[model samples]
Target: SGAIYVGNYRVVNRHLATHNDWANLVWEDSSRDLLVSSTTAQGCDTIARCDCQTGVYYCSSRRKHYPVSFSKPSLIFVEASEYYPARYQSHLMLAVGHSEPGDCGGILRCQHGVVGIVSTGGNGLVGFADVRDLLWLDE
Candidate 1:
């Protein structure tokens, strides 16, 4: 019901499918139209067409995937030692809306090291960053 990461920092990628625990699902293919796993569990996997260039995410579930815009939060990069420069850059791209309870998680790309893998919201999985620089990579 959410995003996934396949491996650790050295070699990490996004996996996509209908029957996985989700932690292993990573990268969203920009080329093919993907079937969004049906929430109904009727065995008919739904599909979503994503337009990365336009930042539009569409789904057949609602017959329309709303366009989501990514922006950097106001700069509060006070802790330079704890995070890297790219973290600030990447932070700006974080999604602004709240993901539904079991919606997909965000992703952060690592700079010169392992990417930071995480899921948004409380009471969920505790994520680790290969390098303490990137903020959110999964989306």
Candidate 2:
């Protein structure tokens, strides 16, 4: 089991294909306009990303990025090492949190949690927090 840092959140991808939809590990970052997902059951240790508007999750090993129909759009996590940070100073951290109903009814929710520590030299801080509590409606 491992996690991937997607924008400002670290999502868990257990890498076990036994569960349906891989445990719904999908996450989205509207600010960055990107989506990251794991291809665990696809028989490889890899992840993929694409525009949030596109429901497709193009695998890293493959060059094509396209959309496919699914009963429900979903994603999963992969090993952090599989994701190469843009810079050497970039770091990955373990974060834990849960989703709760938002005040705006079922349209959204609040995902507040204590994200783990950052690399020593990256931000000059031991750790940080995920303060973006507004969960998108599509997520």
Candidate 3:
């Protein structure tokens, strides 16, 4: 295990799970002063996995976790960001047309869980993988 800093925030990735489609990681806030309290804004208490065709997606982008909406999920060609390159290409990758979130590894959250993972993106379009197709996401 190791630690890194995002701007002023100390980030320590405590857990990691890798797949041909994703490299999921988990971390916690370690600073006491920045501790979460009742004053903090509410967060999703229950995030359900996206397991059906919702047609639309809710995405997060750039250097922050901000919501981005794009219509439709289709399969096509697009460039994968170097940080999170596709694992040798497959039917596993999916796409959508719209704005770039300015960074890779952004996520598409829908049905409370993610329907897509930021994979290929360019020129008002992004290609992500279909998360609903996974049967192994749960053990």
- Report the number of the highest-lDDT candidate: 3
lDDT measured at residue 38 in model 2 versus the true structure, 0 to 100: 41
lDDT of each: 0.27, 0.25, 0.37
Give residue 95's error in model 3 in angstroms.
6.6
Q: How accurate is candidate 2 locally (lDDT)?
A: 0.25
Model 2 per-residue lDDT tens digits across residues 7-103: 4333432221125334444544422222334444332222232212213322222333323222212222222332332322212221222211110
Residue-level lDDT tens digits of model 1 in 71-113: 3222322122221222222212334433332332333332222
TM-scores, all candidates, are 0.25, 0.22, 0.40
Q: Which ten residues in a row have the lowest lDDT in candidate 2?
A: 100-109
- Identify the leading candidate in terms of TM-score: 3
Q: What is the C-alpha RMSD of each candidate to the true structure, in Å?
A: 13.5, 17.5, 11.5
Runs in model 1 lying further than 4 Å from the true structure = 3-54, 58-64, 72-92, 105-118, 121-139
Candidate 3 TM-score, true structure as reference: 0.40
The residue ranges of model 2 lying beyond 4 angstroms of the native Cα positions read 1-8, 16-54, 73-139
List candidate 3 segments past 4 Å from native. Answer: 1-74, 79-102
Higher-TM-score candidate among 1 and 2? 1
Candidate 3: clashing pairs of residues? 94-128, 98-124
